[PDB]
Amino acid sequence: ANKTVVVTTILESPYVMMKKNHEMLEGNERYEGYCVDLAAEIAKHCGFKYKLTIVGDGKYGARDADTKIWNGMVGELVYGKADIAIAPLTITLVREEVIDFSKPFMSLGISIMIKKGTPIESAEDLSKQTEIAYGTLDSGSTKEFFRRSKIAVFDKMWTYMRSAEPSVFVRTTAEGVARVRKSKGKYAYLLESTMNEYIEQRKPCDTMKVGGNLDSKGYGIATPKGSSLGTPVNLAVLKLSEQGVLDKLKNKWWYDKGEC
Amino acid sequence: NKTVVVTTILESPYVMMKKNHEMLEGNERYEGYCVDLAAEIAKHCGFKYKLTIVGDGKYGARDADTKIWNGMVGELVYGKADIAIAPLTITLVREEVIDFSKPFMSLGISIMIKKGTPIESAEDLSKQTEIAYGTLDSGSTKEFFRRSKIAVFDKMWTYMRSAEPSVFVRTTAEGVARVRKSKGKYAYLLESTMNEYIEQRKPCDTMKVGGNLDSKGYGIATPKGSSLGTPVNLAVLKLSEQGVLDKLKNKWWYDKGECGS
Amino acid sequence: GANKTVVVTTILESPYVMMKKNHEMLEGNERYEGYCVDLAAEIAKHCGFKYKLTIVGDGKYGARDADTKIWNGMVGELVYGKADIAIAPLTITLVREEVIDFSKPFMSLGISIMIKKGTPIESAEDLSKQTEIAYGTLDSGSTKEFFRRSKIAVFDKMWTYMRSAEPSVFVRTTAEGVARVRKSKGKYAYLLESTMNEYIEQRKPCDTMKVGGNLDSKGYGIATPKGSSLGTPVNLAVLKLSEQGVLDKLKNKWWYDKGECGS
Amino acid sequence: NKTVVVTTILESPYVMMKKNHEMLEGNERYEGYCVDLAAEIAKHCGFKYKLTIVGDGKYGARDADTKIWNGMVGELVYGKADIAIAPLTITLVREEVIDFSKPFMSLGISIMIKKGTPIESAEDLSKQTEIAYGTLDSGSTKEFFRRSKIAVFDKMWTYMRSAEPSVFVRTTAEGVARVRKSKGKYAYLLESTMNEYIEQRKPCDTMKVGGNLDSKGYGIATPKGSSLGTPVNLAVLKLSEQGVLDKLKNKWWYDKGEC
């Protein structure tokens, strides 16, 4: 009886981070963050023991069109290397077809990041001008959102981005944030609201989130089909929501530990 | 190929009888956000269906003494309907007895004022008594306040429970009318989705103020073990990613609004 | 939602808004003429909207009752949702700015002295040093408040005189103040806004004069409810009209080109 | 993070370096109308602050070729300062990119003569040529005349463009000096605020005449989305109604006057 549950997750701030003294600590105590606290709450309400592991390839979960192989945390579940994933993993159609998702534990959507002082207050403001350049990650869901949109404001933004020279796209999130900070008020970046809000509270306190969200998505906990963990985990997420614990954890890691 | 029985509830703008309904028949008698949503779900899942209205006019709660479920949840649990498509909130006690799709719409507790009222937030309300404030006498909004350990919300609860005359109301319609007729001296706490809808309706005299106090979602419901559960959930996710859910909300709340823009 | 006709609130006071001589033969917006009628047409053209001119129900500008906390006048119609925009001689003040949005000012003004021609008075200092010629203000509003709160010696001397004088030197309406100058045979002087003083000086029977420099400085602005989508476009339009010379052209038209006196 | 960065410009009597500035430090190095105004704004809004002088010495205009903003406006849009408190005019192109308070001081185009010159108005100048008249060779006053469709002002413009020798000057200082050295045969067109200031300076030989030819105002500027915007706007109106703005103008133009 009593087999230790294998949890897979990903090193991304403020969800999972290495503690300052981590090389002198062992096991689960090496790590801290929003998803570390969430994992402890889920285990307490479901009555299991667990070991935290970091996903081997550093990826979330996508299926290669040519080989048909799943990478990332999703791959670790379908091929039997982990029992549960507790991470900022977005609930999507292709993922839901091969694993089970809990109801969402956190909400998010596409949003605008500016350097403080830039005269932009909304997506409509960006669309009507070209002096302040703007763009997205060079691959992924945000770029595809703009490519396929039939909303007037968003399609105008896409045709601008597609035709702009030099390229307004970036290879990583970190590259996008750095481009805003170094471009002297002349670049704005489109990214998820959760990351935008987090960076706003970190030194040197030179960025701001503006406007409402452009779409709606959620993060969920993932388990393999037929797992004895699926139902208990889903009920625990709903209990934590109604008790106010999820809101308490978001405030802790974004604002109580903020620097601005 | 048996016709699927859908249960729902008559509440604007989700489901409404068309003005000329007496000259029409079947599903064509009805219009609204949930009428459009039902059609999209059926197309993607490949079934035919009949829209029916819940017999007792309720959403779904369990009697503390008899342990019997009422409303749309009851019709699913006891085998009288196949699927519920309505503004039905995803909660722990409901999830224990029926299956829910991932959410099709988000919402949270919010403040309704008559235009001109000097209030911008829950904290503003908590610090005074000249402007009275309250909730429905039953349901998720009232119970949120009863159990909160947040200082501002616990203070609001103790005020509401002891206030005279009663600050509670029996229906949504009663709450909205009380705001409109009280000359700025009543504010109403309700779901953000309904607050947003009413702001775009004649006589255009109400406003939504402040951020949401909590976060939840509406979901499509099926009985446990139903062969509809999995295809319905995948259809909701496809419609979300195609932008159809946002398109339908914008249509019924804002494109059809009566207060300009 | 679909576009609605914009509801404008304003007030019948010459030369800002007046009924045309042939008004019973006209309909809608065309019944009216004046400075604010011309301004409304220019604002609507630059912002691209259709509109209806309506007259404020209670005949007031906008003040809050100290006991009930309720706003009256044009400000009230905006705060409680009965109108979309106010285009009128409405002074930009702190308490009003707290509850509605104001454009940058479209016209400047300040407190000034009106006399009957022949009266031996040339300045505020002249008034302050004597009592044979009585002097006063509106019984409510910004002009009365300027004197009550001033820490300038000459202005406080004027205030204590006015507060203590019997019979009362205050008047209920602007029109009553002007009539009191005209009927008092050289023995009353009236303190009022420079814009009105200048207008009356160009009207028959041409028996009044403006004397001295202005005592303070303020401006009239266009007002919208907080959060209105009209606020920003209206503000940018006022600045364009200013820089193009249109505001100055309209002031000269209604005060001096259409004047009736010595000129 | 708590100390607010203020940008301003060295122009008398708004901001000046004290004679003994090298024996002083920080904000105490500077004096003037906008120095007193900054102190009042900060008191009413509850913030601490540091005075800085704009790096390039300019007010704020956009280069048409590079599309980059210079001056104090540039320091706001590009993230180098939090607020500008200076003699900066409220204009359409500036209002599109930053937030302006309601105006703290009014001004307009006006006529400066040498004491004794027989001129009382723009119409007087327009009807003659013995007394020459002109403006700064670039900037807003020249452009006002170039675009006018008013008969008197367009007659003045056609005269100025064709007059010999040139009636235009490179700086404000050059204009004032030309009035003083021309024995009444040159009159200079400039802002009423500056005209009034110079009339109260030694050797007390100039005068302001006539009504203003146009109307403008100076405003305080903050970046879009700033938490300072609303409190600053409300503070300007409070100071106006308390008589403090008029008190400060009288202090720096007349109590400290030399004539």
Of chain B residues 182-241, which have a CB less than 8 A from chain C? 200, 204-205
CB-CB under 8 Å, C80 with B261: no
- Whether residue D92 and residue C239 make contact (CB cut-off 8 A), yes or no, is yes
- Please tell me what DSSP assigns to residue C120: S
Instruction: Give the closest residue to A50 by CA, choosing from A40, A60, A58.
Output: A40
Other Cβ atoms less than 10 A from the Cβ of A256: the count is: 9
Residue B220: Cβ within 10 Å count: 26
Asked if residue A88 lies in contact with residue A197, where contact means CB atoms within 8 angstroms, the answer is no
CA–CA gap between residue A11 and residue C143 (Å, rounded): 67
| C-alpha radius of gyration, chain D, whole number | 20
Which chain B residue has the Cα nearest residue C5?
A: B260
CB of B255 closer than 8 Å to CB of C1: yes
Contact call for B204 and C81, based on CB within 8 A: yes
A238, B90 contact by CB (below 8 A): yes
- Amino acid identity for residue D124 in this structure: D
Q: What separation, in Å, do the N-terminal and C-terminal C-alpha atoms of chain C show?
A: 52
Q: Which residue has the tokens 């667990």?
A: A50
Q: Report the residue from A92, A150, A244 with minimal CB separation from B237.
A: A92
Distance from CA of D237 to the nearest CA of C (A): 6
Please answer yes or no on whether C94 and D234 come within 8 Å at the CB atom. yes
According to DSSP, the residues that pair with A144 across neighbouring strands are none
By Cβ distance, the residue of B115, B118, B260 closest to C4 is B260
Structure tokens of D27? 């904000």
Cα–Cα–Cα angle for C124, C129, C131, rounded to 5 degrees: 100
C188 and C196 in contact (C-beta within 8 Å)?
no
Q: Please answer yes or no on whether C81 and B116 come within 8 Å at the CB atom.
A: yes
Q: How deeply is B162 buried, as exposed, middle or buried, from its count of CB atoms within 10 A (0-12, 13-18, 19+)?
A: exposed
Quickly list DSSP for D12-69.
Answer: TTTBEE-TTGGG--GGGGEESHHHHHHHHHHHHHT--EEEEE-TT-----B-TTT--B
CA nearest A6: which of A102, A68, A60, A73? A73
At C260, which helix (H) or strand (E)?
Answer: none
Whole-angstrom distance, CA of residue A187 vs CA of residue A114: 7
| Of B245, B224, B194, B211, the residue nearest B89 (C-alpha) | B194
Closest CA in chain C for residue B253: C1
Chain B residues with CB under 8 Å of C229 CB are 261
Q: How far apart are CA C192 and CA C174, in angstroms?
A: 8
Residues near B34 by beta carbon (within 8 Å), at least 6 away in sequence: B8, B14, B15, B85, B86, B87
Cβ proximity of D110 and D179 under 8 Å: no
User: What distance in Å separates the CA atoms of residue D184 and residue C6, rounded to the nearest whole number?
Assistant: 56
Contacts for B196 with CB less than 8 Å, ≥ 6 apart: B208, B253
Largest separation between any pair of C-alpha atoms in chain B: 61
Q: Return the residue in A113, A129, A131 with the most chain D beta carbons within 10 A, the one to mutate for interface testing.
A: A131
User: Rounded to an integer, what distance in angstroms lies between the CA atom of residue B61 and that of residue B71?
Assistant: 7
The sign of the torsion formed by the CA atoms of D251, D252, D256, D259 equals negative
Rounded Cα distance between D146 and D153, Å, is: 9
Instruction: Answer whether B210's CB lies under 8 Å from B113's CB.
Output: no
Q: Exposed, middle or buried: residue A170 (CB in 10 Å: 0-12, 13-18, 19+)?
A: buried
What's D255's DSSP letter? I
Residue with tokens 């993060």: A219
Considering CB atoms only, which of B96, B103, B237 is closest to A235? Answer: B96
CB neighbours (10 Å) of residue B81? 22
User: Strand pairing partners for D208?
Assistant: D112
| Amino acid present at D158 | T
C-alpha to C-alpha distance for D217 and C74, rounded to whole angstroms:
26
Q: Resolution of the deposited coordinates, in angstroms?
A: 1.4
Determine the distance in angstroms separating the CA of A204 from the nearest CA of chain D, rounded to an integer: 9
Q: Could you tell me which of D169, B184, D239, A251 has the C-alpha nearest to residue C68?
A: B184
Omega within 30 of 0 (cis) for the link into C205: yes
SS3 state at C256: helix
Helix (H), strand (E) at residue B31: strand B30-31
Q: What is the dihedral of CA C102, C107, C112, C117, to 10 degrees?
A: -140
Handedness of CA A191, A192, A195, A198 (dihedral sign): positive
The reply to whether residue B148 touches residue A92, judged by beta carbons under 8 angstroms, is no
- List % helix, strand, coil for chain D (3-state, nearest 5): 40, 20, 40
Residues D190 and D136 sit within 8 Å (Cβ to Cβ): yes
**Which chain A residues touch D96 with a CB distance below 8 Å?**
119
By the 8 A CB rule, do C53 and C10 touch?
Answer: yes
Query: Does B259 contact C at CB distance below 8 Å?
Result: yes
Which chains have 3+ CB pairs within 8 A of A? B, D
Contact indicator for D111, D125 with CB cutoff of 8 Å: yes
Among C97, C240, B114, C32, CA closest to C8: C32
Query: Contact at 8 Å (CB) between B252 and B37?
Result: no
Nearest-5° angle of CA D5, CA D6, CA D9? 140
The single residue listed with the structure tokens 């601008």 is A160
- Dihedral angle computed from the Cα positions of residues A145, A149, A153 and A154, in that order, rounded to the nearest 10 degrees: 20
d(CA C240, CA C246) in angstroms, rounded, equals 9
Which chain B residues are within 8 Å of C2, Cβ to Cβ? 257, 260-261
Our CA-based measurement puts residue A172 at a distance from the nearest CA of chain D, in whole angstroms, of 25
Helix (H) or strand (E) holding B33: helix B33-45
Residues of D in contact with A131 (CB under 8 A): 67
Domains, chain B, with CATH or none: 2-107+217-256 (3.40.190.10), 108-216 (3.40.190.10)
A116: contact with D, CB 8 A cutoff: yes
Q: Which residue matches tokens 């004027």?
A: C158
Helix (H, G, I), strand (E, B) or coil at D249: helix
Nearest to D243 among C98, C105, C150 (CB): C150
Contact C94 D238 (CB under 8 A): yes
Burial code of A65-98, b = ≥16 C-beta within 10 A, e = fewer? eeeeebbbbbbbbbeeebbbbbbbbbbbbebbeb
DSSP code for C239: H
Instruction: Give the integer Cα–Cα distance in Å for C81 and C103.
Output: 19
Q: Classify C222 as helix, strand or coil.
A: coil
The tokens describing A169, both together, are: 């796209």
Whether A117 and D1 lie within 8 Å, measured CB to CB: no
- What was the elucidation method? X-ray
Q: Parallel, antiparallel, or unpaired: how do β-strands B216-218 and B49-53 relate? A: unpaired
Cα distance between residue D224 and residue D95, in whole Å: 10
CA–CA dist C40, C45 (Å, integer): 9
C254's CB contacts (< 8 A; 6+ apart) are: C15, C34, C35
Q: Which residues of C touch B259 (CB under 8 A)?
A: 1, 4
Task: Identify each DSSP E strand in chain C by its residue range.
Answer: 6-10, 18-19, 32-33, 51-55, 85-86, 100-102, 107-109, 111-116, 134-136, 188-193, 208-211, 218-220, 223-225
Is D96 within 8 Å of chain C by CB? Answer: yes
User: CA-based angle C96:C97:C98, to the nearest 5?
Assistant: 90
User: What's the CA gap between C140 and C117, in Å, rounded?
Assistant: 27
Cα distances (angstroms) measured from residue C14 to each of A259, B55, C32, C112: 59, 65, 11, 19
Query: Checking DSSP bridges between strand D16-17 and strand D4-8, what pairing results, if any?
Result: unpaired
Q: How many Cα neighbours within 13 Å face the side chain of C161? A: 19
Interface of A with D in 123-182 (CB under 8 A): 131
For A106, name the nearest residue in chain B, comparing CA atoms only: B215
Taking contacts as CB-CB distances below 8 angstroms, the residues of chain D near C108 are: 106, 215
Please identify which residue in the block is written with the tokens 């404000």. Answer: D172
Bond into C233 cis (ω within 30): no
Whole-angstrom distance, CA of residue B220 vs CA of residue B98:
10
Joined tokens for residue C223: 């007002």
Chain D residue whose CA is closest to C149:
D242
Return the DSSP state at D190. Answer: E
Length of chain A: 260
Rounded CA gap, D153 and A11, in Å?
A: 71
Q: Assess whether chains B and A touch, using the rule of 3 or more C-beta pairs within 8 angstroms.
A: yes
**A238: nearest CB among B95, B149, B237:** B95
Contacts of C165 (CB under 8 A, 6+ apart): C134, C136
The end-to-end CA distance of chain A, in Å, is 49
Beta bridge partners of A210: A112
C79 touches B at CB < 8 Å = yes
Q: Residue D175 has what DSSP assignment?
A: H
Chain A environment of B192 (Cβ under 8 Å): none
Q: CB-based contact (8 Å) between C245 and chain D?
A: yes
- Is residue C3 within 8 angstroms of chain B, CB to CB? yes
Distance CA A115, CA A129 (A): 17
Closest CA to A158 of A119, A92, A214: A214
Is A9 within 8 Å of A224 (Cβ atoms)?
no
Which residues of chain D lie closer than 8 angstroms to C94, CB-CB?
234, 237-238, 241
Going by C-beta distance under 8 Å and a sequence separation of 6 or more, which residues neighbour residue B167? B132, B133, B134, B135, B160, B186
What chain C residue is nearest to D99 in terms of C-alpha separation? Answer: C232
Q: What is the largest CA-CA distance in chain A?
A: 65
Local structure of B249: helix, strand or coil = helix
The angle subtended at Cα B115 by Cα B113 and Cα B116, nearest 5°, is 105
Buried b (16+ CB within 10 A) or exposed e, C175-188: eebbebbbeeeeeb
Separation between Cα atoms, residue C181 and residue D51, nearest integer Å:
52
| DSSP structural state of residue B222 | E
CA distance A32 to chain D (A): 28
DSSP β-bridge partners for residue B96 = none
Physical contact, D and C (3 or more Cβ pairs within 8 A): yes
CA distance, residue C231 to nearest chain B CA (Å) = 13
∠ Cα C169 C174 C176 (to 5°)? 60
> Would strands D16-17 and C208-211 be described as parallel, antiparallel, or unpaired?
unpaired
Report which of A210, A33, A10, A191 is spatially closest to residue A108, judged by C-alpha positions.
Answer: A191
How many CB atoms are located within 10 Å of the residue A108 CB?
A: 20
Of D67, D98, D225, the CB nearest to A208: D225
Residues of chain C in contact with residue B260, where contact means CB-CB under 8 angstroms, are: 1-4
Q: How far apart are the C-alpha atoms of C146 and D243, rounded to whole Å?
A: 9
DSSP chain A: --PPEEEEE--BTTTBEE-TTGGG--GGGGEESHHHHHHHHHHHHHT--EEEEE-TT-----B-TTT--B-HHHHHHHTTS-SEE-SS-B--HHHHTTEEEPSPSEEE-EEEEEETT-S--SHHHHHT-SSSEEE-BSSSHHHHHHHH--SHHHHHHHHHHHH-SS---BSSHHHHHHHHHHTTT-EEEEEEHHHHHHHHTSTT--EEEES--SS-EEE--EEETT-TTHHHHHHHHHHHHHTTHHHHHHHIIIIIT---
Distance CA(A190)–CA(A158), nearest Å, equals: 12
